[model samples]
Target: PKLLYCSNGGHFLRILPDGTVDGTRDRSDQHIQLQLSAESVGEVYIKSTETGQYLAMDTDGLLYGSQTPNEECLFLERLEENHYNTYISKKHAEKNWFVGLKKNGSCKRGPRTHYGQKAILFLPLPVS
Candidate 1:
């Protein structure tokens, strides 16, 4: 399990109370133990172990958790400057939607996020 840390605001990506993806300033237990795996090499499929939900995005650029993996759930992961990472929606690459988090520790709408946004960059950190 690992925590996706957003350097922009020093926040950690986490599942919201409603199952939507957001950010937290602290390393909350339920927020840090996200089970990450790949269906293909370098692919990122995020699943919240505490919530037992798979992280996915809607075509509308909404970030939420699902009971099953959707094709759009497949992410096109990339490593960029400062060793940060970006998780773009593979199916929505045409639009370039990313799983972004705001400085306020909130979820940034995918359509509103971009590759250069600090709020969109992350560091996959480890725990036990």
Candidate 2:
């Protein structure tokens, strides 16, 4: 029931075969199969069910995947005024950076100004 949906982009967060995090409009098993876990109240780790890789962020602000979860892989879930959730890197919390997607659907850590069109929305999957 938990799904990571990108409202502004109309895409879902998923892992590419090359181990990069990206957005996909398709709601298939590979693209929509994400397992989210809370390491703390606001901190979470999202892993791919298909590839078994954890969504990870590098110190450089690039988003990718890892075989194991670590500090850089943890994200802080922030609530927005519109009821959407934005994911900020735990390490970059002081900077207010978030996990944002590029035009080409690549994932990156961008500031609020850089994520107008790339902001994400996490929602529960609709019942059939």
Candidate that would win on lDDT: 1
lDDT of 1 by residue, 31-101 (tens): 55788889887787898888778788897998888878888688888899888889998888889899888
Model 1, poorest ten-residue lDDT window?
Answer: 24-33
lDDT of 2 by residue, 23-101 (tens): 8877764645877889789888888877778888776777888888888889888777777788888887777667776
Q: Which stretches of candidate 2 lie over 4 Å from their true place?
A: 111-120, 124-128
lDDT of 2 at 9: 65
Native-to-model Cα distance after best TM-score fit, residue 16 in candidate 2, in Å: 1.5
Q: In terms of TM-score, which candidate is strongest?
A: 1
Model 1: lDDT equals 0.83
Count clashing residue pairs in model 1.
0
